């Protein structure tokens, strides 16, 4: 993996966000997982060594993004200052916001989705549908708090550039909460669209024409899930944003939605 390796830490270098003497921050590209096939923790010592020469030992990770998710990734030069950045977010102390295309336009068009997320993740809500009627259901033992503020940004009829803010940090909950929450899956996302993990999402005729693609397409269109900014606490605030994608502001345009003003 080292040519690889090496590769893809002089593109993550090129695109950079902020270095000072503690944090070296990147742009996360699409598709590369955070660990192990190419991952960030391959290149942590050959980015070290690139970035502060051969006597450099590997830069640590501070927090996690999934694989279909791009942008702000904060990374750390000292372990002790990695833990340091660890804390802030178990202690919920970092402001992290996302932006999504959603299928579907939230309503209402601002609010919170607080329903517990258990883990193969679903929702776990207070009632059961029998026949058409709800039955209280005791909270599952395993059932995690899961909370996501959500704003839309922009939207048409059928399409909404959405900002999210994951109070928690529970896995995919910012795409459960979106498709099974408010019945508006981020586009590209297969696994939680339709009730059927195996099948591609399904997209209008309009949303499809807009696109500029054919339905068997569709399972080829990536998640749109850009981590946008985080703000951290001092180690004053840092105040981290990341462009979007240019697929992502692609589809924002075929999509007639608009950056925020
Ligand atoms: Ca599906
Ligand atoms: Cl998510
Ligand atoms: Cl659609
Ligand atoms: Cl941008």
Not at 6 to 25: C, F, Y
Not at 167 to 176: C, P, S
Request: charged share 20%; glycine share 4%.
């Amino acid at each position: 993996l080292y040519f690889q390796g090496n590769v893809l830490a002089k593109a993550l270098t090129r695109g950079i966000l902020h270095q000072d003497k503690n944090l070296v921050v990147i742009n996360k590209p699409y598709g590369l997982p955070v660990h192990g096939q190419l991952c960030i923790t391959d290149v942590l010592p050959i980015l070290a060594k690139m970035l502060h020469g051969h006597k450099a030992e590997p830069l640590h990770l501070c927090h996690r993004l999934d694989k279909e998710t791009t942008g702000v990734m904060v990374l750390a030069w000292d372990k002790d200052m990695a833990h340091q950045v660890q804390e802030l977010f178990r202690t919920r102390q970092v402001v992290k916001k996302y932006w999504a295309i959603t299928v579907h336009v939230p309503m209402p068009s601002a609010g919170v989705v607080d329903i517990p997320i258990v883990e193969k993740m679903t929702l776990s809500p207070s009632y059961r549908m029998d026949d058409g009627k709800m039955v209280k259901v005791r909270r599952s033992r395993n059932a995690q708090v899961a909370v996501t503020q959500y704003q839309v940004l922009s939207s048409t009829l059928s399409s909404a550039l959405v900002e999210l803010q994951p109070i928690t940090g529970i896995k995919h909950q910012l795409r459960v909460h979106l498709s099974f929450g408010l019945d508006c899956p981020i586009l590209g996302d297969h696994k939680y669209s339709d009730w059927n993990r195996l099948a591609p999402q399904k997209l209008s005729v309009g949303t499809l024409k807009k696109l500029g693609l054919e339905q068997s397409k569709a399972r080829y269109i990536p998640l749109h899930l850009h981590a946008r900014q985080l703000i951290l606490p001092a180690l004053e605030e840092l105040n981290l944003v990341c462009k979007l994608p240019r697929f992502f502001v692609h589809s924002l345009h075929r999509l007639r939605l608009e950056m925020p003003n």
